[PDB]
Amino acid sequence: KSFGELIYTPDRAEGEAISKAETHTPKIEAPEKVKADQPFQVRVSVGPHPNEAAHSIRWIELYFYEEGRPFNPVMLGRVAFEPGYAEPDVTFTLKLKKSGVLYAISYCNLHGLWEARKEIKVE
Amino acid sequence: KSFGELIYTPDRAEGEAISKAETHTPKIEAPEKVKADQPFQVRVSVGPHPNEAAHSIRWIELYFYEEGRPFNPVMLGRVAFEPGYAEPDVTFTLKLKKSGVLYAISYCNLHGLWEARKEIKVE
Amino acid sequence: KSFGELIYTPDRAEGEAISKAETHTPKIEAPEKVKADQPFQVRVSVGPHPNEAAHSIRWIELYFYEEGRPFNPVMLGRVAFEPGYAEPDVTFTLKLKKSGVLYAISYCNLHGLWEARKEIKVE
Amino acid sequence: KSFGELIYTPDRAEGEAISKAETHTPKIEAPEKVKADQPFQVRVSVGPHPNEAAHSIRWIELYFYEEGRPFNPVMLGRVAFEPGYAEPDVTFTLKLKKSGVLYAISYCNLHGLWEARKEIKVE
Ligand SMILES: [Fe+3]
Ligand SMILES: [Fe+3]
Ligand SMILES: [Fe+3]
Ligand SMILES: [Fe+3]
Numbered sequence: 045k046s047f048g049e050l051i052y053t054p055d056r057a058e059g060e061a062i063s064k065a066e067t068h069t070p071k072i073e074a075p076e077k078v079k080a081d082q083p084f085q086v087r088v089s090v091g092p093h094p095n096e097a098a099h100s101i102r103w104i105e106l107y108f109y110e111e112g113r114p115f116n117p118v119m120l121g122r123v124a125f126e127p128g129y130a131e132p133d134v135t136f137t138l139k140l141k142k143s144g145v146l147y148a149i150s151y152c153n154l155h156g157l158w159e160a161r162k163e164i165k166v167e
Numbered sequence: 168k169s170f171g172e173l174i175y176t177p178d179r180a181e182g183e184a185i186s187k188a189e190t191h192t193p194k195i196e197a198p199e200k201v202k203a204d205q206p207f208q209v210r211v212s213v214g215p216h217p218n219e220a221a222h223s224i225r226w227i228e229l230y231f232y233e234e235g236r237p238f239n240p241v242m243l244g245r246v247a248f249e250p251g252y253a254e255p256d257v258t259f260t261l262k263l264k265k266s267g268v269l270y271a272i273s274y275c276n277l278h279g280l281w282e283a284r285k286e287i288k289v290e
Numbered sequence: 291k292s293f294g295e296l297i298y299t300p301d302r303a304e305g306e307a308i309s310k311a312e313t314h315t316p317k318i319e320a321p322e323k324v325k326a327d328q329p330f331q332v333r334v335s336v337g338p339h340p341n342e343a344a345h346s347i348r349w350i351e352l353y354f355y356e357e358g359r360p361f362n363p364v365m366l367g368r369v370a371f372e373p374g375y376a377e378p379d380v381t382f383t384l385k386l387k388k389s390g391v392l393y394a395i396s397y398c399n400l401h402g403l404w405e406a407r408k409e410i411k412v413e
Numbered sequence: 414k415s416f417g418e419l420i421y422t423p424d425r426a427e428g429e430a431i432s433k434a435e436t437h438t439p440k441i442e443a444p445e446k447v448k449a450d451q452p453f454q455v456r457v458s459v460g461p462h463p464n465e466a467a468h469s470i471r472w473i474e475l476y477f478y479e480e481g482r483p484f485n486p487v488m489l490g491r492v493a494f495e496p497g498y499a500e501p502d503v504t505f506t507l508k509l510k511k512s513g514v515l516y517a518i519s520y521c522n523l524h525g526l527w528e529a530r531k532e533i534k535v536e
Binding site for chain 3: 102109
Binding site: 329354364365366367368369370371372374375376377379380381382383384385386 | 452477487488489490491492493494495497498499500502503504505506507508509
């Protein structure tokens with residue numbers, strides 16, 4: 045198996061048995077359209093999910109596929125959360141110059157890597 | 168010199184020459200009082216400051232001194248920002264059980280480590 | 291595109307034009323066979339590749355697919371390197387209980403995410 | 414209290430009661446003298462110390478005070494370890510241009526931040 049194959053895509057996440065008990069797939073909130081170079085908020089959150097030393101969303105990575113860039117993706121940010129203190133809920137502020145796709149990857153110490161994605165238009 | 172001594176405290180930050188050109192000391196926004204186990208937002212931001220490959224706030228660490236805990240501090244979260252895409256501005260969601268002090272530490276690739284602190288009461 | 295698809299697999303890495311100029315695919319050095327619970331070294335390195343503020347291997351993530359684990363992978367470690375000071379070369383010390391596959395993912399600020407993988411037998 | 418004051422210095426570490434049970438102060442192995450721009454290894458390790466989900470050295474940060482640099486320190490690298498899989502033992506490869514002081518900061522989820530320091534001469 046390739047590393048990429050191991051990641052739970054949002055289409056496959058829906059049919060997982062664990063998903064009946066808890067949610068790992070990130071929710072990405074962001075404007076569908078933004079102006080170039082103008083700051084906007086992106087909120088990423090995972091839940092409901094346990095948040096304890098033995099089981100929690102340890103971190104979230106935010107990436108961006110920039111349309112037309114010769115190589116992709118760009119990592120935009122990464123946030124790590126202390127189990128039992130910080131909820132897996134973060135807001136970033138970004139500025140973009142070109143349209144593309146935002147990817148949020150969450151990591152659970154028990155349940156692996158889960159992906160969310162969201163198109164964003166820059167005009 | 169100890170490592171701790173190298174960090175720019177908010178009282179010393181005020182008199183630094185670089186501070187006339189740009190701000191490194193984090194701003195922490197958080198309720199003065201919260202209820203135990205109830206989620207609340209903490210916003211940490213640094214600015215105005217350059218945000219480019221050659222010079223940016225690379226990351227922010229959020230720590231907590233918990234009054235009465237036998238050892239301190241607890242790291243609550245850490246966020247890294249891609250230069251030129253992500254602004255050094257983050258919102259966390261926390262739950263606390265005991266009163267203490269929030270510390271935000273920012274890192275600039277040119278200008279080092281800068282500290283902000285803020286008391287928080289849990290009742 | 292899924293996030294997983296974006297990652298440069300070691301089979302695809304070979305035919306990339308950029309690979310004629312520089313190497314992004316991690317080299318993983320690790321024993322083929324180890325004893326359960328006994329510490330061993332894993333060395334991960336990327337090169338030759340530029341190492342400057344404007345272009346460097348920013349970090350490496352080490353993951354493990356554990357055969358028989360209900361969910362995968364487990365993140366084993368992550369290391370970030372200061373451009374121009376630290377070379378993208380790290381040695382970890384691990385203990386494993388079960389056989390599986392080590393994955394090393396490198397990130398270049400210009401050229402994206404590149405994967406290496408290596409089987410490890412635990413007896 | 415300032416954030417810097419909270420960090421356990423190597424002189425204070427010696428007299429801590431917890432230090433009779435386990436070691437948090439990093440050991441830094443590095444040449445006393447190196448040539449400018451020539452790669453060398455720095456090994457940082459913490460132990461003996463528990464390594465489990467509930468209690469482990471979560472990460473190590475490596476910093477450098479560069480003599481003559483207008484601001485300090487520079488972060489050289491940071492490594493995070495999965496509890497129960499990775500031992501808190503890392504080797505970095507560095508290149509330096511100027512003399513200074515290496516600082517290693519370890520973090521324990523129960524016992525806080527502990528400092529080690531080591532002079533390095535560049536000739
Ligand atoms: Fe989970
Ligand atoms: Fe600065
Ligand atoms: Fe590259
Ligand atoms: Fe400890």
